[PDB]
Amino acid sequence: MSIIEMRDVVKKYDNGTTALRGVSVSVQPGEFAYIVGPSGAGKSTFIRSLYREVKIDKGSLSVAGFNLVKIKKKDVPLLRRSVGVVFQDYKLLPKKTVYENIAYAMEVIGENRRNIKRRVMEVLDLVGLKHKVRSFPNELSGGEQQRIAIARAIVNNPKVLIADEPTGNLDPDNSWEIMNLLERINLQGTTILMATHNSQIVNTLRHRVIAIENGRVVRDESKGEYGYDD
Ligand SMILES: Nc1ncnc2c1ncn2[C@@H]1O[C@H](COP(=O)(O)OP(=O)(O)O)[C@@H](O)[C@H]1O
């Protein structure tokens, strides 16, 4: 049974722009999917519908178990606990150390403080930054900051992880390091949806590719090629 089920979804913004124009996508638990397509296609609108920042107008949508057509306002935080998000402009808390940043991601969802030390150190092992446990974000490279943003996003073991252009401002070597981390997270079972314009990553680290244009899925292929010139 699917962890994300989108059927005939429509989203039209108030200025009349139909950003999702009948979108159907079914993602099984543990899948890794790239979301690709030209600027303005609807990738961000698609991503943001998955954590209920965007409300759909028509269609059905279930994410991480939750029916997003029916979900009550007060329960959106429960959906958010199950959906880790690496914002394209993810900003760490500048006056918190790496440890405090990751720990806060647990405290803020109500986790027991008793669970924090073990989990934070486990995720620092995962991302390979145990030695930066006391660093502040400004002391880290861009690639290190992104790895800590990913650590924050997965700290509560969400069912789904969404990453909006996680390598978009990283050089090739750092981009591959972020991809190695996301791949290891996926092998642990976490479902990953990643919006991206990096054809080399998509064409080399082959996964499912969902291409969106003008609000429509135009291609949905296993181990897919990138398919665009930009
Ligand atoms: N907040 C908004 N209000 C109105 N129109 C929007 C808004 N966000 C996006 N759009 C429009 O919806 C379409 C899809 O945008 P977006 O989802 O950001 O695409 P992408 O992420 O692929 O660049 C575009 O025509 C865009 O201008």
Author numbering: 1 to 230
Sentences reproduced from the published study:
Two different crystal forms in complex with ADP were obtained in the same crystallization conditions belonging to two different space groups, P 1 and P 21. P 1 crystals contain one molecule per asymmetric unit and diffract up to 1.36 Å resolution, while P 21 crystals contain three molecules per asymmetric unit and diffract up to 1.57 Å resolution. Unless otherwise indicated, the description of the monomer structure provided here is for the highest-resolution crystal form belonging to space group P 1. FtsE binds ADP by both van der Waals and polar interactions. The Walker A (P-loop) motif wraps over the β-phosphate of ADP forming an extensive hydrogen bond network with main-chain nitrogen atoms of G40 to K43. The position of the K43 side chain, essential for nucleotide binding through interaction with the β-phosphate, is stabilized by H bonds with main-chain oxygen atoms of G37 and P38. The switch histidine (H197) that stabilizes the transition-state geometry in the ADP-bound state interacts with the β-phosphate through two interspersed water molecules. The A-loop provides an aromatic side chain (Y13) that packs against the purine ring of adenine involving a π-stacking interaction and positions the base and ribose of the nucleotide. This interaction provides an additional binding free energy for ADP through an extensive hydrophobic interaction that buries 48.4 Å2 of surface area (calculated with PDBePISA v1.52) between its aromatic ring and the adenine base of ADP. Superposition of the NBD of MacB with the FtsE-ADP complex results in an excellent fit with an RMSD value of 1.0 Å for 174 Cα atoms.
FtsEX is a membrane complex widely conserved across diverse bacterial genera and involved in critical processes such as recruitment of division proteins and in spatial and temporal regulation of muralytic activity during cell division or sporulation. The component FtsX is an integral membrane protein, whereas FtsE is an ATPase and is required for the transmission of a conformational signal from the cytosol through the membrane to regulate the activity of cell wall hydrolases in the periplasm. Here, we provide the first three-dimensional (3D) structure of FtsE from the notorious pathogen S. pneumoniae, and we show that it presents all the conserved structural motifs of the NBD members of the ABC transporter family. The nucleotide-binding site is located in lobe I near the interface between the two lobes and presents the nucleotide sandwiched between the Walker A and B motifs.
